[PDB]
Amino acid sequence: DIVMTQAAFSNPVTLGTSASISCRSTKSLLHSNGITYLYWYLQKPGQSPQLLIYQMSNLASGVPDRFSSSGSGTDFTLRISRVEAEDVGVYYCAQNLELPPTFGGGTKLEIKRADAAPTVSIFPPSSEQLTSGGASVVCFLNNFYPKDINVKWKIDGSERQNGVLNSWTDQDSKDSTYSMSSTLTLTKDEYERHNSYTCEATHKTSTSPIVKSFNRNE
Amino acid sequence: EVKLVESGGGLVKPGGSLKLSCTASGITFSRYIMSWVRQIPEKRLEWVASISSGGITYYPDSVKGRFTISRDNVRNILYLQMSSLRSEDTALYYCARGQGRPYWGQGTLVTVSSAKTTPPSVYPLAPGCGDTTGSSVTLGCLVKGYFPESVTVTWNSGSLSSSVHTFPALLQSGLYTMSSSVTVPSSTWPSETVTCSVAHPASSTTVDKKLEP
Numbered sequence A: 001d002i003v004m005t006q007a008a009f010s011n012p013v014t015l016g017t018s019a020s021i022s023c024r025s026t027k028s029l030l031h032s033n034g035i036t037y038l039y040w041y042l043q044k045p046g047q048s049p050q051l052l053i054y055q056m057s058n059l060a061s062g063v064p065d066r067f068s069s070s071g072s073g074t075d076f077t078l079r080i081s082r083v084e085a086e087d088v089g090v091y092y093c094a095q096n097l098e099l100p101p102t103f104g105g106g107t108k109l110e111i112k113r114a115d116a117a118p119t120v121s122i123f124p125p126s127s128e129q130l131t132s133g134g135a136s137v138v139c140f141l142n143n144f145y146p147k148d149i150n151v152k153w154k155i156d157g158s159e160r161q162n163g164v165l166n167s168w169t170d171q172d173s174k175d176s177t178y179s180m181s182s183t184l185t186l187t188k189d190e191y192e193r194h195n196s197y198t199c200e201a202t203h204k205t206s207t208s209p210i211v212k213s214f215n216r217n218e
Numbered sequence B: 001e002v003k004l005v006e007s008g009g010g011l012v013k014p015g016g017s018l019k020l021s022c023t024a025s026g027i028t029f030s031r032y033i034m035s036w037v038r039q040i041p042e043k044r045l046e047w048v049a050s051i052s053s054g055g056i057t058y059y060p061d062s063v064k065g066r067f068t069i070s071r072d073n074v075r076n077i078l079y080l081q082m083s084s085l086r087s088e089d090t091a092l093y094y095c096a097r098g099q100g101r102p103y104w105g106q107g108t109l110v111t112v113s114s115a116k117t118t119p120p121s122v123y124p125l126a127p128g129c130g131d132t133t134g135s136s137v138t139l140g141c142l143v144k145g146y147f148p149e150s151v152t153v154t155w156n157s158g159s160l161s162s163s164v165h166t167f168p169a170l171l172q173s174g175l176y177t178m179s180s181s182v183t184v185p186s187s188t189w190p191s192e193t194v195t196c197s198v199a200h201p202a203s204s205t206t207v208d209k210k211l212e213p
């Protein structure tokens, strides 16, 4: 098979500057008809893969001319001039010279931007959930940069780890930040035996954590 | 106009069979090598099958003997018959005209499982601590206990992607849970309505919550 190799990650790119993604193939993709059968596509969460470039240098429909591709038969580079926030995603090279079809492992484009502390919001279990004997306490830690963050839960001032599940978004297509949801799930009975619940977020922005909290009896 | 449309996906028991179909506007399948390729959570695309213009069929050894690709030249339909299905065949399946300028469809989800299609419970996330909330207010919906993926959470008919965040679903003893948040200026809400609309096509369910102070 023709193996397509590309790096998982690229240099973080500041908005308005260029990015370059490399790929290579074990066999030349130049056909005797003079066309090179390399294509590039972009994957974003929540939508279908989108073709960017085909036959090594031809733009696909809808694709702006800040995208370009060049190469030999075996070594290729996709370039993006003047990167925009919506360009974030995973860029794949692949070949359509021969069967079997083969695909690269994808290169994630990451945008570099200014640091941002998280906006932290805490929510008690909804009455509706409690009626079924469940109790999820949710904390969103939203629109922060860079992506590294930590969350800690306190029930009546005492650290709690069990029952916490975290979910992280990919980089935002509008503001190039990251977000996190953290949920502490407990029975209704254990929820109702404690009063103070707390979410605390630690992020490089501040050496002190942003803490959010409520008291159940209020 | 030019597009491919896959259909036929759904839930199937381990060891079962399922047949996918693909139709097209503007692509005459008989002229091309037509293919099926699938996308599984962690991974780059995986090739499943191809059929040449002359009807010759090609498979990876991973599905050979279980999957069959065929084409109805006259009606212009592409098929993938799958048998002896395994949990590992769980994927989004795409038909593709891969030659030249590749075209592919939106894909159709096949889930190989003994589990039962289960609708979400949807809980509102509104501030309730003390009665204070800042310049901007963050609201959400917690979507719990559904199977399979996926759900779509739409805020005010999509008018608010006013910092909408969609958090990836997490699996927990058989069922999925996800959440979605939106941020609006405090001048707008609660003085105007904010609603989360949670669509779960697989269970034929939509749930809307109007968030309340």
Ligand SMILES: O=C(O)CCCC(=O)Nc1ccc(/C=C/c2ccccc2)cc1
Binding pocket: A041, A049, A095, A096, A097, A098, A099, A100, A101, B033, B035, B037, B045, B094, B095, B096, B097, B098, B099, B102, B104
């Ligand atoms: O003409 C020849 O002999 C060679 C043709 C080989 C061929 O069809 N390759 C080929 C087959 C399928 C694909 C599919 C790509 C794809 C990419 C993203 C989403 C869904 C599908 C891409 C390439």
